[PDB]
Amino acid sequence: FSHFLYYLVLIVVIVYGLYKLFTGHGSDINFGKFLLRTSPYMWANLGIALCVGLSVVGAAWGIFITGSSMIGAGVRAPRITTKNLISIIFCEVVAIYGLIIAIVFSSKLTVATAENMYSKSNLYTGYSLFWAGITVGASNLICGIAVGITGATAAISDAADSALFVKILVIEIFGSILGLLGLIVGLLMAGKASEFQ
């Protein structure tokens, strides 16, 4: 039924675009004026909220992936249940990344005067906070899921042999590069963005 709706929305978009284009009014579907006239606080607050939301839905994702297999693998070998908690920690740090980026973004969130409200800088710092919240929340989502998967494999290879956890912790390190790189990119994107003035 979802494929029927995906086809129906596509057919309605094609029929509306071709009807609007054939009648000489095709510039009325104006995405640029939509970007110019929507409020920058929508993009800013939506970016902050999706940053701290999608970091947590990746952190909590990885936490259950390498938590349920840690508890399952700890039934026969209970000497992993404290040492291997660093796999919970590596997928938990992607939430503090999104938190400390969301607070730094919300510091740039003041009341702009209505005479200069849809200005160049106010609209720039809405766009920048939106996409720099998206590129941090999604990167921490994907990093949390990857660290959870490579910690769920580590929690079972630890219970197999003790000398394997040191060898497969390296894969968790290379997986946890990603959230820190998103942490860097989201600070470079909203680095030149000013407050709302």
């Binding site: 349920s68 297999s69 508890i71 399952g72 039934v75 026969r76 079972i156």
Partner: protein, 343 residues
């Protein structure tokens, strides 16, 4: 591997823990050095079997009681893993036990033709293939009054689709036909279940583990039909499963295989089963290939095929322990190293 650990997180990690109790080659060599069944019990007590024969105490300890209790703890571990299963996993666990239900049906309705007592033909039945109307197969002789009375409410009921009851009640010749045909329809249904609802990493490595069951059953049907069967190939082709690696070209030549060479030249064209019928024990070839296919099903992580690969490996472990304890109790040690160890 992103949606696996929702319902299957605890289930895999315990089965992965059950995998680490598989006896290695050194733990088998330490069992072949034993002199007494008591020494073999004490050697198994240092493994993850520890104190499973504790209520025996060195006097009533036979080589069949070891095979009883070592498989009984396999069955209780399987029931513990099945009780924590839900959804598609629990249905996958039920589909494993259906193949043991078929063997218990075919073992229960041969104990009534020979008029053996119902209390002793059920202790030989398999505990995982238990359904609630299994003792009540001792009520009728013909196939129709055992289907329409007992086997309709069983989950073996869709598998009676080609068993043609010509009002001949039962000899020992057609119960094997009913057994092979139920197992044929079951292999079809469980392959379609694996292809349909089981996710993709546990799909490709389970279709191979199940097509191997189909190929082994095809070769065993087409090779046991030489000695104790005189049947037509059009009636023999209803016994061979059509899911495997061996079906579309080679089970045709196994259907019209009237001689041993009709089997051997049919299995020479398939690439991974050639050389099985040349040298050595054929049953050991199939068990070795089963363990080599179950070994590389543990190497894929987020898969529910690890349950199948665990319980078949643990059954081979119980068979190897039973073979060793049969060797060290009857004082024959010429083939004590005929066990199969890939772990």
């Amino acid at each position: 591997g992103v949606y696996f650990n929702i319902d299957n997180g605890f289930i895999e990690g315990v089965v992965r823990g059950y995998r680490n109790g598989l006896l290695s080659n050194n733990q088998y060599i330490n069992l072949t050095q034993c002199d007494t069944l008591e020494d073999l019990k004490l050697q198994l007590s240092s493994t993850d079997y520890g104190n499973f024969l504790s209520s025996v105490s060195s006097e009533s300890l036979t080589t069949s009681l070891i095979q009883e209790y070592a498989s009984s703890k396999l069955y209780h571990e399987f029931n513990y893993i099945r009780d924590q299963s839900s959804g598609s996993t629990r249905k996958f666990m039920d589909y494993i036990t259906y193949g043991y239900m078929i063997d218990n049906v075919a073992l229960m309705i041969t104990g009534t033709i020979h008029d053996r007592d119902k209390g002793e033909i059920l202790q030989r039945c398999h505990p995982l293939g238990w359904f609630d109307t299994l003792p009540t197969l001792s009520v009728a002789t013909d196939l129709e009054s055992l289907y329409e009375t007992v086997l309709v409410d069983t989950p073996l009921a869709p598998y009676f689709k080609n068993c043609f009851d010509t009002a001949e009640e039962l000899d020992d010749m057609n119960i094997e036909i009913i057994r092979n045909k139920l197992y044929k329809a079951y292999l079809e249904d469980f392959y379609n279940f694996v292809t349909e609802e089981i996710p993709e990493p546990a799909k490709e490595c389970m279709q191979t583990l199940l097509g191997f069951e189909a190929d082994r059953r095809s070769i065993n049907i087409a090779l046991n039909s030489l000695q104790s069967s005189d049947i037509d190939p059009d009636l023999k082709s209803d016994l061979l499963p059509n899911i495997g690696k061996l079906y579309p070209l080679a089970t045709f030549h196994l259907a019209q295989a009237q001689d041993f060479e009709g089997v051997r030249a049919a299995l020479a064209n398939v690439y991974e089963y050639r050389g099985f019928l040349e040298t050595g024990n054929l049953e050991d070839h199939f068990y070795q290939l089963e363990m080599e296919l179950c070994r590389d099903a543990f190497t894929q992580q987020f898969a529910i095929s690890t349950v199948w690969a665990w319980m078949k490996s643990k059954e081979q472990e119980v068979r190897n322990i039973t073979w060793i304890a049969e060797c060290i109790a009857q004082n024959q040690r010429e083939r004590i190293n005929n066990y199969i160890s890939v772990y």
